[PDB]
Each structure stands twice: as structure tokens, then as C-alpha cells.
mmCIF file of C-alpha atoms and ligand atoms in Angstrom:
data_model
loop_
_atom_site.group_PDB
_atom_site.id
_atom_site.type_symbol
_atom_site.label_atom_id
_atom_site.label_comp_id
_atom_site.label_asym_id
_atom_site.label_seq_id
_atom_site.Cartn_x
_atom_site.Cartn_y
_atom_site.Cartn_z
ATOM 1 C CA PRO Y 3 45.418 113.193 144.529
ATOM 2 C CA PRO Y 4 42.833 114.484 147.078
ATOM 3 C CA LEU Y 5 45.673 115.791 149.249
ATOM 4 C CA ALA Y 6 47.109 117.699 146.278
ATOM 5 C CA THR Y 7 43.712 119.281 145.570
ATOM 6 C CA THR Y 8 43.362 120.165 149.257
ATOM 7 C CA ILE Y 9 46.759 121.891 149.256
ATOM 8 C CA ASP Y 10 45.853 123.774 146.061
ATOM 9 C CA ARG Y 11 42.681 124.989 147.785
ATOM 10 C CA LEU Y 12 44.713 125.977 150.863
ATOM 11 C CA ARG Y 13 46.976 128.062 148.631
ATOM 12 C CA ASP Y 14 43.931 129.679 147.106
ATOM 13 C CA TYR Y 15 42.686 130.615 150.595
ATOM 14 C CA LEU Y 16 46.048 132.012 151.710
ATOM 15 C CA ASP Y 17 46.114 134.143 148.564
ATOM 16 C CA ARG Y 18 42.495 135.330 148.997
ATOM 17 C CA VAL Y 19 43.064 136.691 152.512
ATOM 18 C CA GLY Y 20 46.665 137.844 152.083
ATOM 19 C CA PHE Y 21 48.189 135.450 154.630
ATOM 20 C CA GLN Y 22 51.844 136.246 153.959
ATOM 21 C CA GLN Y 23 51.243 139.989 154.306
ATOM 22 C CA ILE Y 24 49.267 139.455 157.538
ATOM 23 C CA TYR Y 25 52.057 137.316 159.015
ATOM 24 C CA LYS Y 26 54.685 139.830 157.889
ATOM 25 C CA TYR Y 27 52.737 142.701 159.467
ATOM 26 C CA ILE Y 28 52.259 140.878 162.775
ATOM 27 C CA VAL Y 29 55.918 139.918 163.234
ATOM 28 C CA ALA Y 30 57.402 143.061 161.545
ATOM 29 C CA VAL Y 31 60.432 143.413 159.283
ATOM 30 C CA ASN Y 32 62.925 143.527 162.173
ATOM 31 C CA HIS Y 33 61.870 140.008 163.286
ATOM 32 C CA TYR Y 34 60.685 138.256 160.098
ATOM 33 C CA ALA Y 35 64.097 136.762 159.221
ATOM 34 C CA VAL Y 36 65.450 136.389 162.782
ATOM 35 C CA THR Y 37 63.674 133.207 163.890
ATOM 36 C CA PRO Y 38 60.623 131.017 163.176
ATOM 37 C CA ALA Y 39 59.811 131.100 166.915
ATOM 38 C CA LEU Y 40 57.730 134.293 166.725
ATOM 39 C CA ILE Y 41 54.157 132.989 166.954
ATOM 40 C CA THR Y 42 54.358 130.578 169.903
ATOM 41 C CA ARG Y 43 52.422 129.509 172.988
ATOM 42 C CA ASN Y 44 53.792 132.635 174.694
ATOM 43 C CA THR Y 45 52.619 135.118 172.028
ATOM 44 C CA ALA Y 46 49.396 133.478 170.761
ATOM 45 C CA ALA Y 47 47.100 135.471 173.064
ATOM 46 C CA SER Y 48 48.518 138.685 171.616
ATOM 47 C CA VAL Y 49 48.031 137.339 168.071
ATOM 48 C CA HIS Y 50 44.389 136.571 168.882
ATOM 49 C CA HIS Y 51 43.900 140.063 170.306
ATOM 50 C CA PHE Y 52 45.322 141.582 167.129
ATOM 51 C CA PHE Y 53 42.891 139.653 164.936
ATOM 52 C CA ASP Y 54 39.997 140.469 167.274
ATOM 53 C CA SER Y 55 40.675 144.179 167.807
ATOM 54 C CA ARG Y 56 42.759 145.422 164.868
ATOM 55 C CA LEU Y 57 41.230 143.154 162.191
ATOM 56 C CA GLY Y 58 37.759 143.264 163.751
ATOM 57 C CA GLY Y 59 37.302 139.521 164.199
ATOM 58 C CA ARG Y 60 36.428 139.194 160.497
ATOM 59 C CA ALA Y 61 35.267 135.702 159.572
ATOM 60 C CA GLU Y 62 37.589 135.549 156.542
ATOM 61 C CA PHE Y 63 40.509 135.274 159.001
ATOM 62 C CA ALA Y 64 38.981 132.520 161.159
ATOM 63 C CA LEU Y 65 40.404 129.544 159.269
ATOM 64 C CA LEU Y 66 43.724 131.390 159.038
ATOM 65 C CA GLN Y 67 44.016 131.489 162.832
ATOM 66 C CA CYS Y 68 43.250 127.761 163.050
ATOM 67 C CA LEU Y 69 46.348 127.271 160.908
ATOM 68 C CA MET Y 70 48.495 129.974 162.499
ATOM 69 C CA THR Y 71 47.887 129.392 166.268
ATOM 70 C CA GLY Y 72 45.383 126.509 166.480
ATOM 71 C CA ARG Y 73 42.578 128.806 167.683
ATOM 72 C CA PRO Y 74 39.114 127.233 167.341
ATOM 73 C CA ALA Y 75 36.613 128.553 164.805
ATOM 74 C CA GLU Y 76 32.944 127.617 164.886
ATOM 75 C CA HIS Y 77 32.223 125.552 161.778
ATOM 76 C CA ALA Y 78 28.985 127.433 161.043
ATOM 77 C CA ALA Y 79 30.774 130.806 161.370
ATOM 78 C CA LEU Y 80 33.214 130.016 158.555
ATOM 79 C CA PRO Y 81 32.471 131.601 155.173
ATOM 80 C CA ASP Y 82 31.009 129.030 152.777
ATOM 81 C CA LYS Y 83 34.170 128.621 150.651
ATOM 82 C CA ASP Y 84 36.360 128.339 153.727
ATOM 83 C CA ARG Y 85 34.057 125.755 155.340
ATOM 84 C CA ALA Y 86 34.595 123.159 152.598
ATOM 85 C CA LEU Y 87 38.346 123.743 152.740
ATOM 86 C CA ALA Y 88 38.262 123.324 156.524
ATOM 87 C CA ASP Y 89 36.540 119.958 156.070
ATOM 88 C CA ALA Y 90 39.205 118.862 153.585
ATOM 89 C CA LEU Y 91 41.970 119.929 155.964
ATOM 90 C CA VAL Y 92 40.362 117.909 158.781
ATOM 91 C CA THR Y 93 40.138 114.868 156.480
ATOM 92 C CA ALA Y 94 43.865 115.325 155.669
ATOM 93 C CA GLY Y 95 44.756 115.549 159.374
ATOM 94 C CA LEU Y 96 46.087 119.099 158.944
ATOM 95 C CA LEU Y 97 43.416 120.527 161.281
ATOM 96 C CA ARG Y 98 41.166 118.936 163.914
ATOM 97 C CA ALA Y 99 37.443 118.955 164.432
ATOM 98 C CA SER Y 100 35.972 119.058 167.930
ATOM 99 C CA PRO Y 101 34.213 115.839 168.967
ATOM 100 C CA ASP Y 102 30.732 117.203 168.204
ATOM 101 C CA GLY Y 103 31.945 118.625 164.869
ATOM 102 C CA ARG Y 104 30.873 122.170 165.748
ATOM 103 C CA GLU Y 105 34.333 123.722 165.444
ATOM 104 C CA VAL Y 106 37.718 123.373 163.726
ATOM 105 C CA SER Y 107 41.050 123.920 165.499
ATOM 106 C CA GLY Y 108 44.765 123.193 165.288
ATOM 107 C CA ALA Y 109 46.363 119.797 164.707
ATOM 108 C CA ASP Y 110 50.179 119.337 164.653
ATOM 109 C CA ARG Y 111 50.987 121.777 161.834
ATOM 110 C CA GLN Y 112 51.595 125.517 162.234
ATOM 111 C CA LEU Y 113 51.463 127.898 159.261
ATOM 112 C CA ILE Y 114 54.271 130.497 159.081
ATOM 113 C CA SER Y 115 55.961 132.542 156.372
ATOM 114 C CA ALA Y 116 59.732 132.621 156.002
ATOM 115 C CA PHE Y 117 61.974 134.181 153.350
ATOM 116 C CA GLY Y 118 58.977 134.853 151.114
ATOM 117 C CA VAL Y 119 57.682 131.239 151.229
ATOM 118 C CA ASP Y 120 54.554 129.923 152.948
ATOM 119 C CA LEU Y 121 55.395 126.971 155.169
ATOM 120 C CA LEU Y 122 53.656 124.424 157.357
ATOM 121 C CA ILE Y 123 55.956 123.409 160.235
ATOM 122 C CA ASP Y 124 55.653 121.062 163.204
ATOM 123 C CA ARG Y 125 53.437 122.951 165.684
ATOM 124 C CA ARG Y 126 54.912 121.000 168.589
ATOM 125 C CA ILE Y 127 58.174 122.974 168.422
ATOM 126 C CA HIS Y 128 56.396 126.194 169.544
ATOM 127 C CA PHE Y 129 53.208 124.960 171.276
ATOM 128 C CA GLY Y 130 52.112 122.229 173.640
ATOM 129 C CA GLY Y 131 54.211 119.557 175.300
ATOM 130 C CA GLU Y 132 54.943 116.634 172.948
ATOM 131 C CA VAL Y 133 58.335 116.313 171.231
ATOM 132 C CA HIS Y 134 58.368 117.545 167.644
ATOM 133 C CA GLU Y 135 59.197 115.344 164.635
ATOM 134 C CA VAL Y 136 60.262 118.036 162.117
ATOM 135 C CA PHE Y 137 62.915 120.599 162.995
ATOM 136 C CA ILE Y 138 63.055 124.276 162.141
ATOM 137 C CA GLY Y 139 64.923 126.988 164.035
ATOM 138 C CA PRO Y 140 66.832 130.279 163.900
ATOM 139 C CA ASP Y 141 69.844 128.403 162.537
ATOM 140 C CA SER Y 142 67.692 127.452 159.521
ATOM 141 C CA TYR Y 143 67.071 131.150 158.889
ATOM 142 C CA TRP Y 144 70.618 132.351 159.338
ATOM 143 C CA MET Y 145 72.097 129.925 156.847
ATOM 144 C CA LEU Y 146 69.652 131.319 154.233
ATOM 145 C CA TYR Y 147 70.311 134.929 155.252
ATOM 146 C CA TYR Y 148 73.899 134.821 153.975
ATOM 147 C CA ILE Y 149 73.047 133.514 150.453
ATOM 148 C CA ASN Y 150 73.554 136.211 147.813
ATOM 149 C CA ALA Y 151 70.365 135.610 145.864
ATOM 150 C CA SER Y 152 71.227 137.992 143.030
ATOM 151 C CA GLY Y 153 74.084 135.684 141.972
ATOM 152 C CA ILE Y 154 71.770 132.715 141.349
ATOM 153 C CA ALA Y 155 71.099 131.932 137.680
ATOM 154 C CA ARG Y 156 67.916 130.214 136.495
ATOM 155 C CA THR Y 157 70.081 127.354 135.191
ATOM 156 C CA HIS Y 158 72.154 126.904 138.355
ATOM 157 C CA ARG Y 159 71.833 123.418 139.843
ATOM 158 C CA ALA Y 160 71.097 123.635 143.566
ATOM 159 C CA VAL Y 161 70.809 121.018 146.310
ATOM 160 C CA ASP Y 162 69.361 121.332 149.835
ATOM 161 C CA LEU Y 163 70.585 118.289 151.782
ATOM 162 C CA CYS Y 164 68.622 117.249 154.893
ATOM 163 C CA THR Y 165 65.723 119.477 153.859
ATOM 164 C CA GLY Y 166 63.301 118.965 156.765
ATOM 165 C CA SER Y 167 60.247 121.188 156.220
ATOM 166 C CA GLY Y 168 61.727 122.189 152.861
ATOM 167 C CA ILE Y 169 62.466 125.814 153.807
ATOM 168 C CA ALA Y 170 65.935 126.076 152.221
ATOM 169 C CA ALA Y 171 64.909 124.176 149.082
ATOM 170 C CA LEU Y 172 61.859 126.393 148.672
ATOM 171 C CA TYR Y 173 63.950 129.528 149.168
ATOM 172 C CA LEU Y 174 66.391 128.378 146.482
ATOM 173 C CA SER Y 175 63.407 127.646 144.208
ATOM 174 C CA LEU Y 176 62.563 131.363 144.246
ATOM 175 C CA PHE Y 177 65.675 131.942 142.104
ATOM 176 C CA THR Y 178 66.681 128.766 140.259
ATOM 177 C CA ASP Y 179 64.568 126.335 138.235
ATOM 178 C CA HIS Y 180 66.674 123.320 139.365
ATOM 179 C CA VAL Y 181 66.492 122.356 143.041
ATOM 180 C CA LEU Y 182 67.086 118.950 144.639
ATOM 181 C CA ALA Y 183 65.827 118.435 148.211
ATOM 182 C CA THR Y 184 66.780 115.333 150.207
ATOM 183 C CA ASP Y 185 65.874 113.692 153.509
ATOM 184 C CA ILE Y 186 65.446 110.218 154.999
ATOM 185 C CA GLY Y 187 62.698 110.770 157.606
ATOM 186 C CA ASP Y 188 59.156 109.758 156.684
ATOM 187 C CA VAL Y 189 57.636 112.756 158.489
ATOM 188 C CA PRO Y 190 59.822 115.532 156.969
ATOM 189 C CA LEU Y 191 59.578 113.934 153.510
ATOM 190 C CA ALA Y 192 55.764 114.063 153.656
ATOM 191 C CA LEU Y 193 55.884 117.670 154.880
ATOM 192 C CA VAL Y 194 58.205 119.015 152.170
ATOM 193 C CA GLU Y 195 55.893 117.373 149.595
ATOM 194 C CA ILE Y 196 53.051 119.469 151.020
ATOM 195 C CA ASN Y 197 55.135 122.649 151.234
ATOM 196 C CA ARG Y 198 56.363 122.244 147.639
ATOM 197 C CA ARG Y 199 52.760 122.162 146.402
ATOM 198 C CA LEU Y 200 51.780 124.961 148.801
ATOM 199 C CA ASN Y 201 54.195 127.276 146.929
ATOM 200 C CA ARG Y 202 53.076 126.180 143.433
ATOM 201 C CA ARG Y 203 56.178 124.074 142.771
ATOM 202 C CA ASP Y 204 56.273 120.507 141.505
ATOM 203 C CA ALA Y 205 58.775 117.939 140.276
ATOM 204 C CA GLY Y 206 59.390 120.060 137.164
ATOM 205 C CA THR Y 207 61.584 122.450 139.160
ATOM 206 C CA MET Y 208 62.211 120.782 142.517
ATOM 207 C CA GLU Y 209 62.919 117.098 143.048
ATOM 208 C CA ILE Y 210 62.225 115.574 146.471
ATOM 209 C CA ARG Y 211 64.419 112.525 147.067
ATOM 210 C CA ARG Y 212 64.650 109.954 149.860
ATOM 211 C CA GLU Y 213 68.433 109.586 150.093
ATOM 212 C CA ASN Y 214 71.195 109.487 152.717
ATOM 213 C CA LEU Y 215 73.440 112.572 152.826
ATOM 214 C CA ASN Y 216 76.575 110.547 152.180
ATOM 215 C CA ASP Y 217 74.989 108.803 149.201
ATOM 216 C CA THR Y 218 74.131 112.144 147.562
ATOM 217 C CA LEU Y 219 77.650 113.419 148.330
ATOM 218 C CA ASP Y 220 79.402 110.436 146.735
ATOM 219 C CA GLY Y 221 77.203 110.657 143.653
ATOM 220 C CA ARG Y 222 78.070 111.952 140.205
ATOM 221 C CA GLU Y 223 75.642 114.901 140.192
ATOM 222 C CA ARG Y 224 77.371 118.280 140.326
ATOM 223 C CA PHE Y 225 75.945 121.461 141.812
ATOM 224 C CA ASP Y 226 76.459 125.199 141.633
ATOM 225 C CA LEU Y 227 74.863 125.867 145.025
ATOM 226 C CA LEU Y 228 74.525 123.645 148.110
ATOM 227 C CA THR Y 229 72.776 124.225 151.438
ATOM 228 C CA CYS Y 230 72.805 121.928 154.466
ATOM 229 C CA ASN Y 231 71.688 122.281 158.069
ATOM 230 C CA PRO Y 232 72.547 118.712 159.124
ATOM 231 C CA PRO Y 233 72.062 117.011 162.473
ATOM 232 C CA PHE Y 234 74.974 118.459 164.430
ATOM 233 C CA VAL Y 235 74.278 118.159 168.180
ATOM 234 C CA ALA Y 236 76.611 115.967 170.226
ATOM 235 C CA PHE Y 237 74.977 114.004 173.053
ATOM 236 C CA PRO Y 238 76.872 111.956 175.683
ATOM 237 C CA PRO Y 239 77.452 108.241 175.049
ATOM 238 C CA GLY Y 240 74.464 106.070 175.884
ATOM 239 C CA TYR Y 241 71.769 108.684 175.202
ATOM 240 C CA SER Y 242 69.366 108.491 172.269
ATOM 241 C CA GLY Y 243 68.417 111.700 170.486
ATOM 242 C CA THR Y 244 66.267 112.199 167.401
ATOM 243 C CA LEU Y 245 66.845 111.953 163.665
ATOM 244 C CA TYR Y 246 67.004 115.733 163.198
ATOM 245 C CA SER Y 247 69.162 116.507 166.255
ATOM 246 C CA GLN Y 248 71.940 113.959 166.776
ATOM 247 C CA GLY Y 249 75.084 114.385 164.730
ATOM 248 C CA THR Y 250 77.506 111.596 163.879
ATOM 249 C CA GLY Y 251 81.103 111.238 165.044
ATOM 250 C CA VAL Y 252 82.656 111.629 168.477
ATOM 251 C CA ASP Y 253 81.738 115.340 168.686
ATOM 252 C CA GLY Y 254 78.517 115.423 166.642
ATOM 253 C CA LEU Y 255 80.178 117.040 163.605
ATOM 254 C CA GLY Y 256 80.653 113.946 161.421
ATOM 255 C CA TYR Y 257 78.117 115.068 158.822
ATOM 256 C CA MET Y 258 79.789 118.474 158.564
ATOM 257 C CA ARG Y 259 83.091 116.704 157.882
ATOM 258 C CA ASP Y 260 81.406 114.431 155.317
ATOM 259 C CA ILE Y 261 79.995 117.429 153.429
ATOM 260 C CA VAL Y 262 83.101 119.623 153.478
ATOM 261 C CA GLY Y 263 85.371 116.782 152.353
ATOM 262 C CA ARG Y 264 83.344 116.199 149.182
ATOM 263 C CA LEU Y 265 82.801 119.852 148.197
ATOM 264 C CA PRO Y 266 85.796 119.983 145.770
ATOM 265 C CA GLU Y 267 84.143 117.176 143.796
ATOM 266 C CA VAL Y 268 80.393 117.836 144.171
ATOM 267 C CA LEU Y 269 80.513 121.593 143.510
ATOM 268 C CA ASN Y 270 81.217 122.902 140.042
ATOM 269 C CA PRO Y 271 84.296 125.173 140.010
ATOM 270 C CA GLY Y 272 83.290 128.454 141.615
ATOM 271 C CA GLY Y 273 80.198 126.970 143.256
ATOM 272 C CA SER Y 274 79.272 127.769 146.848
ATOM 273 C CA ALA Y 275 78.057 125.775 149.843
ATOM 274 C CA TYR Y 276 76.242 127.230 152.857
ATOM 275 C CA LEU Y 277 76.283 125.217 156.092
ATOM 276 C CA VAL Y 278 75.177 126.008 159.638
ATOM 277 C CA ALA Y 279 76.032 124.382 162.965
ATOM 278 C CA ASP Y 280 76.312 125.151 166.678
ATOM 279 C CA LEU Y 281 80.066 124.580 166.997
ATOM 280 C CA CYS Y 282 81.970 123.769 170.180
ATOM 281 C CA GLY Y 283 85.005 125.869 170.935
ATOM 282 C CA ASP Y 284 87.303 127.639 173.353
ATOM 283 C CA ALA Y 285 87.415 131.387 174.022
ATOM 284 C CA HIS Y 286 89.248 131.996 170.724
ATOM 285 C CA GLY Y 287 86.624 130.337 168.531
ATOM 286 C CA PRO Y 288 85.038 127.135 167.247
ATOM 287 C CA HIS Y 289 87.317 124.092 167.045
ATOM 288 C CA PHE Y 290 85.896 122.989 163.687
ATOM 289 C CA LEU Y 291 87.263 126.043 161.890
ATOM 290 C CA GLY Y 292 90.791 124.741 162.520
ATOM 291 C CA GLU Y 293 89.960 121.648 160.454
ATOM 292 C CA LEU Y 294 89.089 123.853 157.469
ATOM 293 C CA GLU Y 295 92.604 125.192 156.850
ATOM 294 C CA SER Y 296 93.122 121.882 155.015
ATOM 295 C CA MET Y 297 90.490 122.975 152.514
ATOM 296 C CA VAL Y 298 92.084 126.382 151.981
ATOM 297 C CA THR Y 299 95.555 124.942 151.379
ATOM 298 C CA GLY Y 300 94.511 121.633 149.849
ATOM 299 C CA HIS Y 301 91.855 122.994 147.478
ATOM 300 C CA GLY Y 302 92.244 126.769 147.185
ATOM 301 C CA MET Y 303 88.869 127.409 148.792
ATOM 302 C CA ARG Y 304 87.558 130.618 150.319
ATOM 303 C CA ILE Y 305 85.759 129.877 153.586
ATOM 304 C CA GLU Y 306 83.793 132.500 155.530
ATOM 305 C CA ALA Y 307 82.441 131.756 159.018
ATOM 306 C CA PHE Y 308 79.718 134.039 160.419
ATOM 307 C CA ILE Y 309 79.414 133.669 164.200
ATOM 308 C CA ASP Y 310 76.017 135.015 165.192
ATOM 309 C CA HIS Y 311 75.480 133.628 168.703
ATOM 310 C CA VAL Y 312 77.891 132.770 171.524
ATOM 311 C CA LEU Y 313 76.907 130.851 174.660
ATOM 312 C CA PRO Y 314 78.978 129.408 177.503
ATOM 313 C CA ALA Y 315 78.740 125.630 177.588
ATOM 314 C CA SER Y 316 77.139 125.832 181.037
ATOM 315 C CA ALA Y 317 74.145 127.615 179.475
ATOM 316 C CA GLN Y 318 73.505 124.611 177.200
ATOM 317 C CA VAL Y 319 73.588 121.916 179.900
ATOM 318 C CA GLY Y 320 69.944 122.429 180.826
ATOM 319 C CA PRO Y 321 68.561 122.646 177.288
ATOM 320 C CA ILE Y 322 70.504 119.542 176.212
ATOM 321 C CA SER Y 323 69.465 117.598 179.320
ATOM 322 C CA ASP Y 324 65.821 118.689 178.984
ATOM 323 C CA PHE Y 325 65.746 117.587 175.350
ATOM 324 C CA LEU Y 326 67.306 114.188 176.111
ATOM 325 C CA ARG Y 327 64.928 113.606 179.012
ATOM 326 C CA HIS Y 328 61.869 114.512 176.897
ATOM 327 C CA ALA Y 329 62.895 112.671 173.726
ATOM 328 C CA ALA Y 330 63.494 109.340 175.480
ATOM 329 C CA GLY Y 331 60.806 109.650 178.164
ATOM 330 C CA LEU Y 332 63.337 109.458 180.991
ATOM 331 C CA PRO Y 333 62.340 110.085 184.630
ATOM 332 C CA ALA Y 334 63.404 113.080 186.681
ATOM 333 C CA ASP Y 335 65.912 111.410 189.019
ATOM 334 C CA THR Y 336 68.536 110.746 186.306
ATOM 335 C CA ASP Y 337 71.601 113.045 186.593
ATOM 336 C CA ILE Y 338 71.749 113.842 182.880
ATOM 337 C CA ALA Y 339 73.301 117.249 183.577
ATOM 338 C CA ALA Y 340 76.493 115.733 185.026
ATOM 339 C CA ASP Y 341 76.823 113.420 181.999
ATOM 340 C CA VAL Y 342 76.424 116.413 179.667
ATOM 341 C CA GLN Y 343 78.965 118.507 181.617
ATOM 342 C CA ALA Y 344 81.527 115.691 181.667
ATOM 343 C CA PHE Y 345 81.073 115.093 177.934
ATOM 344 C CA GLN Y 346 81.430 118.796 177.109
ATOM 345 C CA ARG Y 347 84.650 119.006 179.091
ATOM 346 C CA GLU Y 348 86.350 115.713 178.213
ATOM 347 C CA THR Y 349 85.248 114.951 174.629
ATOM 348 C CA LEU Y 350 84.049 118.236 173.130
ATOM 349 C CA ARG Y 351 86.476 120.577 174.959
ATOM 350 C CA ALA Y 352 83.521 122.968 174.783
ATOM 351 C CA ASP Y 353 83.919 126.113 176.841
ATOM 352 C CA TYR Y 354 81.512 127.848 174.434
ATOM 353 C CA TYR Y 355 79.089 127.076 171.629
ATOM 354 C CA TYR Y 356 79.288 129.251 168.494
ATOM 355 C CA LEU Y 357 76.249 129.308 166.202
ATOM 356 C CA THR Y 358 78.092 129.598 162.894
ATOM 357 C CA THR Y 359 77.028 129.847 159.261
ATOM 358 C CA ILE Y 360 79.836 128.770 156.914
ATOM 359 C CA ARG Y 361 80.097 129.747 153.256
ATOM 360 C CA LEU Y 362 82.566 127.650 151.247
ATOM 361 C CA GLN Y 363 83.587 128.392 147.668
ATOM 362 C CA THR Y 364 85.700 126.321 145.319
ATOM 363 C CA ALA Y 365 88.267 127.691 142.867
ATOM 364 C CA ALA Y 366 88.361 130.979 144.747
ATOM 365 C CA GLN Y 367 90.233 133.966 143.374
ATOM 366 C CA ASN Y 368 90.837 135.130 146.994
ATOM 367 C CA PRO Y 369 91.317 131.835 148.889
ATOM 368 C CA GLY Y 370 91.534 131.865 152.665
ATOM 369 C CA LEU Y 371 89.638 131.353 155.912
ATOM 370 C CA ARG Y 372 87.804 134.373 157.361
ATOM 371 C CA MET Y 373 86.054 134.233 160.729
ATOM 372 C CA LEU Y 374 83.622 137.031 161.551
ATOM 373 C CA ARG Y 375 82.866 137.629 165.225
ATOM 374 C CA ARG Y 376 81.325 140.521 167.046
HETATM 375 N N1 SAH T 401 71.822 110.893 157.045
HETATM 376 C C1 SAH T 401 70.886 111.753 156.656
HETATM 377 N N2 SAH T 401 70.684 112.005 155.324
HETATM 378 C C2 SAH T 401 69.716 112.888 154.894
HETATM 379 N N3 SAH T 401 68.926 113.551 155.818
HETATM 380 C C3 SAH T 401 69.120 113.311 157.131
HETATM 381 C C4 SAH T 401 70.083 112.412 157.580
HETATM 382 N N4 SAH T 401 70.026 112.390 158.935
HETATM 383 C C5 SAH T 401 69.066 113.253 159.347
HETATM 384 N N5 SAH T 401 68.486 113.815 158.237
HETATM 385 C C6 SAH T 401 67.482 114.870 158.201
HETATM 386 O O1 SAH T 401 68.254 116.036 158.500
HETATM 387 C C7 SAH T 401 67.395 117.104 158.859
HETATM 388 C C8 SAH T 401 68.125 118.026 159.836
HETATM 389 S S1 SAH T 401 67.128 119.394 160.513
HETATM 390 C C9 SAH T 401 67.343 120.619 159.187
HETATM 391 C C10 SAH T 401 66.029 120.871 158.443
HETATM 392 C C11 SAH T 401 66.024 122.069 157.482
HETATM 393 N N6 SAH T 401 67.035 121.939 156.431
HETATM 394 C C12 SAH T 401 66.236 123.366 158.245
HETATM 395 O O2 SAH T 401 67.276 124.031 158.090
HETATM 396 O O3 SAH T 401 65.354 123.776 159.011
HETATM 397 C C13 SAH T 401 66.156 116.408 159.417
HETATM 398 O O4 SAH T 401 65.037 116.745 158.612
HETATM 399 C C14 SAH T 401 66.468 114.912 159.316
HETATM 400 O O5 SAH T 401 65.393 114.065 158.995
HETATM 401 N N1 LIG T 402 82.102 143.035 168.802
HETATM 402 C C1 LIG T 402 82.868 143.018 170.037
HETATM 403 C C2 LIG T 402 83.340 144.431 170.331
HETATM 404 C C3 LIG T 402 84.500 144.833 169.453
HETATM 405 O O1 LIG T 402 85.380 143.978 169.210
HETATM 406 O O2 LIG T 402 84.494 145.976 168.945
HETATM 407 C C4 LIG T 402 82.041 142.451 171.187
HETATM 408 O O3 LIG T 402 80.844 142.191 171.031
HETATM 409 CA CA1 CA T 403 54.198 141.490 167.061
HETATM 410 NA NA1 NA T 404 44.630 130.583 172.991
HETATM 411 NA NA1 NA T 405 70.715 120.834 162.379
#
């Protein structure tokens, strides 16, 4: 109950000072829907300069910067209404106080706006040097980009599987009054609870459920609209990843297979699913799309694949190895890169990675697979 009141007061503050408009102005309309990695350790100094020089350092924006970049604000310099909120946020662990109590600064949550929603995310993904516990990324944004929002009815039943911060569920909640959001991690489940309240939603229009993906998929509930950005990264045998990163199956795509295979049953006829994954492939395209011809022929589906980023597998060796080394606390003499290269070649057959959003529709009047590449 005190946390809920604190989040209500945070929403009041964000409304009072026009947070979403400020964020939107800073990042601009040609970046707002590209990626959440806009305000980061590398751009924070320029954000601070904007507040200082273009917004005049006004005290009403001091608490906002604590939330947005982690910048310290002197406690006595906060406006009276903001000061009590700051204290409540410190009590909730959503901001820090300095040891002498004379200032407030960032904790592990960063405030952004995405797709018209206000969102706390894990600050560690864009700042600092400790591994994050809640994922968000450009792939999250691109799977939402392709949803045709004008086709969503207020009565449509929607589900966001593997919800994380809640971003896709909260986006869907802009249009339909029936959204289910699922996860199994303690940390993302607590965060989507906060973000639901931060956007004036509650259990009356969006249910948050602790439930395994495959349990929701086997269930009897039927949906008109489904979104899922599942764990999809394949790591070599013997390496531990994280809950949000490591996909199941030999090639990391087991959860994608699980979802697609149940779509004819879990979607109402004519319903649509939107998935996103970084898919291994050869020069012609992602391997996974070949598995989907069985859903065109077997179920009369229309399947559209939007390839928005292409990288050679060699360009992912470092990022994968860095992530594995950081996540498990491994030392610097381990030849992780060779293990990743061998796995890409022998198991994944990955010459390239294709960041792909996939729309799948049942009972299609124009069934077929369509792959869009630039
Ligand atoms: N078996 C499973 N069932 C349900 N959720 C799972 C799961 N395995 C992992 N997860 C959750 O899957 C999420 C993948 S990250 C995607 C988060 C969010 N939908 C976004 O697009 O940004 C993580 O939050 C993780 O906790
Ligand atoms: N889109 C291609 C160019 C083309 O096929 O016209 C590359 O990039
Ligand atoms: Ca800018
Ligand atoms: Na700084
Ligand atoms: Na994912």
C-alpha cells in the first residue's frame, strides 16, 4: 500500500512537469521509437547541459533528472512537494540518498518514455558496470512498431508473454481493456507491477500473472492479439546466461517454436501474433523462416517477417563473449570467443544474424510467407 501511494505521487509529479513531453523533445521524433538506449552513460552529460542551459536549471526538473540519468539533487533545493516524494522514493529503493542525507540521486531504475507510456527500466543496461536484471532493447520497440493499433477493439483479448518491464503489455493497454502480462522472474514481475500503476492501470484492465510461457500456451484462454519477445539467444554448451537472455533448444529458438506451434489453438480465428528474435541464418535469410512453411500449409496462416538489422556472425562473437564473461563473473583468460565461433559454425550454421519481427495471422484470406529485407 505505501508503494502504491508512492507510485501515484510519482505519476502526479511526472504529469506536473510534463515528463513525457520533455523526454520526447530531448530524443526527438526520429529517435523516440528506434531504441530505448538514447539516454545512456554516453549521452547523460549532454542531457544535463540541456536541462542546465535550455531549461535554465529550474528546480522543478531536479527530481526528474534523478530519475532520468541519476544526477544528484540537493535535498534542500527540491521544491517542497517534490521533497516529500523524493523521500518516499528513497524509502522504496527507487532513488538513493547520499550518506549524509543532503542529496538524492539515482538507484537502479531509469525513467524513460516509450510508445506513449512512462516506464521505469533497469538503469544498469545503459549506465554503470553491473549486469542488469530486467531486459529492454531495440528489439522490444520494433516488435511493437509493426502492430496496427487502429485494428484493436476495446473488447479484444490480448496477451504479452514474457513481459519484462511491461512495455508491450502497457502499449496494448492503450487500445484494449483486456491485457494479460506474464513472466516468471521476481525482478521483472515487481517492475511491471510498478509500471502498471505508473500508467494508471490496475487489475481491472491488465492482469499480471506469474506463469511459465508453455503453461499459458497450453491453457484454454483464447486471444485476439499476442506479443512475445522471449529469451532467444543461443549460448555454447556449458555456459550459463540469464533468465531474460538464454533461449531453449539446441539453437536458442525453442520458445519461438513453442509459441508458433500453439498459435492455431490459442489465437481466435483471424487473430494476430507479433514475435521478435535475432535469428541465425545464411546469406539468403534466417533459418527459422523455413520452419514456418509448415504453418502456412498446415494452418492457412499469413506470416510476415520484417528484417530490420543484419550482422555477420563474426560481429556478434565479442558481444556474446562479453555478456557471458560478465554474467558469470568469469576471468579474462578463458577463450570464450573460440567456443562461440565454433558453436555458431557447427550448431547454429550462423553466417549472419537477422533481427526479425514476425507477424502471424490465423485463418488468413491471403495465406503465405512474406520476408521483407532491404
Ligand atoms: N519460461 C518463461 N516463461 C515466462 N517468462 C519467461 C520465461 N523465461 C524467461 N522469461 C522472461 O522473459 C523475458 C524476456 S525479455 C523481454 C521483455 C519485454 N517483453 C521486452 O520486449 O522488452 C524476461 O523478462 C524473462 O524473465
Ligand atoms: N535494399 C537493398 C538494395 C535493393 O535491393 O534495392 C540493400 O540494402
Ligand atoms: Ca538529443
Ligand atoms: Na553525470
Ligand atoms: Na528476447
